[PDB]
Paper text:
E263 isolated from a deep-sea hydrothermal field in the east Pacific1920, was the first thermostable member of [name] endonucleases from thermophilic bacteriophages to be biochemically characterized. The overall structure of [name] HNHE contains two antiparallel β-sheets and four α-helices, and shares a conserved ββα-metal fold with those of other [name] endonucleases.
The initial 38 residues (M1-R38) could not be solved because of the disordered electron density, indicating the N-terminal region of the protein is very flexible. Firstly, [name] HNHE possesses an extra α-helix (α3: residues 85–92) at the C-terminus, which is absent in Gme HNHE. However, no additional metal ion was observed in the [name] motif of [name] HNHE. Here, we found that [name] HNHE and the Zn ion were co-crystalized, supporting the importance of the Zn ion for DNA nicking. There is no significant structural change for the two structures of [name] HNHE with Mn2+ and Zn2+, however, the C-terminus of [name] HNHE shifts by a distance of approximately 1.3 Å upon binding of Mn2+.
Numbering used by the authors: 39 to 130
Amino acid sequence: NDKEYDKHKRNQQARAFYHSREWERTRLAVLAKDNYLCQHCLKEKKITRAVIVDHITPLLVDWSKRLDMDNLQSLCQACHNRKTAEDKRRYG
Ligand SMILES: [Zn+2]
C-alpha cells in the first residue's frame, strides 16, 4: 500500500486500542500488580502514586507487544514525561 495510508491505518489501530476491552482489563492488571505505584520512582527508592500505564516499547513502535505485561509499567506523570523524552532519543 501507499506509505502514508499504512501510517494512517497504524494510527487508527492504535487509537482504537486504547478503547478496547483488552486494554481496559490489562491496564487494571498492571496497576494492580504494581500496587498502583510508579515503577520508575520505586527503582529510584521513592514512593509515588501511578497515574498512567505506559508501553516500554511504544505501541506505535511494536504492535505485537501491545498487551504484554512485561512491556507495561505504571508511572507517575513526572516519570511519564521523562520517559517521553528518553523515547524521542530512541525513536524520534
Ligand atoms: Zn515516578
